[PDB]
Amino acid sequence: CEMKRTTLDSPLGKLELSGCEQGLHEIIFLGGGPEPLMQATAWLNAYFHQPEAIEEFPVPALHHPVFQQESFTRQVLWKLLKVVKFGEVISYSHLAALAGNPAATAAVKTALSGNPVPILIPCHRVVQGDLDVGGYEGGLAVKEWLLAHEGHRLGKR
Ligand SMILES: [Zn+2]
């Protein structure tokens, strides 16, 4: 792909976004019109700074290779994106079922670890169970901060 990059300041530090004309590829934690990259930047900016309007912002097309071919991993990521909204959580186990393989909690955890576009695809909203927020590829404190930003019981600022 012919790649383009942009950065966005956020409460979680600088975010590097990468994408081509067919879609956003990655959102990386470094520590506005029609192209997918501009839609992604606008979406993430709204997520942090205008969260009440987040459903109004177009979700960018996604073009990381994990989205280019059918797989259970792609199903996990797509179903998570489609279904689990701002201020909600879902268990690894129920997400496994949603993605078409009810037994497959460990496989869901591995799929989520491969998510190239965190927050937009909300791996932070997938928890172990009602009273166990579980782990996070980006660090437990970040997961808990995002859930607090979204007003969830399991969040901690
Ligand atoms: Zn691409």
Task: Compute CA distances 8 → 18, 36, 53, 55, 119, whole Å.
Answer: 11, 15, 18, 20, 14
List, in order of start, the domains of the chain with CATH numbers. 2-63 (3.30.160.70), 64-153 (1.10.10.10)
| Rounded distance from Cα 63 to ligand 1 centre (Å) | 5
116 with 153: CB under 8 angstroms?
no
Data resolution in angstroms: 1.7
| Rounded distance from Cα 61 to ligand 1 centre (Å) | 10
- Method used to solve the structure: X-ray
Which one, of 9, 120, 5, 116, lies nearest residue 54 by Cα? 120
| Rounded distance from Cα 70 to ligand 1 centre (Å) | 16
State phi, psi for 129 to the nearest 5 degrees: -175, -175
**Would residue 1 show up in a list of annotated catalytic residues for this protein?**
no
